């Protein structure tokens, strides 16, 4: 599923991401835009053999099991394919564990490089929230 901007904002808010660990809703929408272009089916291979999955490009090296990242962890206790569903529950719940990890949203390379220190509120402008 490819989400609309305000559609994803609303779903993320419903799932309790707005101000989760102090990160406003705009931060999450911005991250999702630049990680996956709002596409739940997005996948990208990393140099180390792991893969990033879903709207927030959650990585198999630590967070999920894709059956092909040998010697990795499954800290969210899920198959990586769960991160590709039209239902974003699994992605959101795993993201909450990631952002609590100690590095906050810096865990997302695209957020650090493209969202951090910018007017992230613009990502929810016009939405009926
Ligand atoms: O959800 N369309 O911005
Ligand atoms: O649960 N919203 O995909």
Curated annotation (Swiss-Prot):
This is Lysozyme C. It holds the Pfam family Lys. It catalyses: Hydrolysis of (1->4)-beta-linkages between N-acetylmuramic acid and N-acetyl-D-glucosamine residues in a peptidoglycan and between N-acetyl-D-glucosamine residues in chitodextrins. In the egg white and polymorphonuclear leukocytes. GO terms for molecular function: beta-N-acetylglucosaminidase activity; identical protein binding; lysozyme activity. PANTHER family: LYSOZYME C. One of its GO terms (cellular component) is endoplasmic reticulum. Belongs to the glycosyl hydrolase 22 family. Substrate binds at residue 101. Its main location: secreted. It comes from Gallus gallus (Chicken). Lysozymes have primarily a bacteriolytic function; those in tissues and body fluids are associated with the monocyte-macrophage system and enhance the activity of immunoagents. Has bacteriolytic activity against M.luteus. It is found in: Secreted. Lysozyme C is capable of both hydrolysis and transglycosylation; it also shows a slight esterase activity. It acts rapidly on both peptide-substituted and unsubstituted peptidoglycan, and slowly on chitin oligosaccharides. It comes from the Eukaryota.
């Amino acid at each position: 599923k490819v989400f609309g901007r305000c559609e994803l904002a609303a779903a993320m808010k419903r799932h309790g991401l707005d101000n989760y660990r102090g990160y406003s809703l705009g931060n999450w929408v911005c991250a999702a835009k630049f990680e996956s272009n709002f596409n739940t089916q997005a996948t990208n291979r990393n140099t180390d053999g792991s893969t990033d999955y879903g709207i927030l490009q959650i990585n198999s090296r630590w967070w999920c099991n894709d059956g092909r990242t040998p010697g990795s962890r499954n800290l969210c206790n899920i198959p990586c394919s769960a991160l590709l569903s039209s239902d974003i529950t699994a992605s959101v719940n795993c993201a909450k564990k990631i952002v609590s990890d100690g590095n906050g949203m810096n865990a997302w390379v695209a957020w650090r490089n493209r969202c951090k220190g910018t007017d992230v509120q613009a990502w929810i402008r016009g939405c009926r929230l």
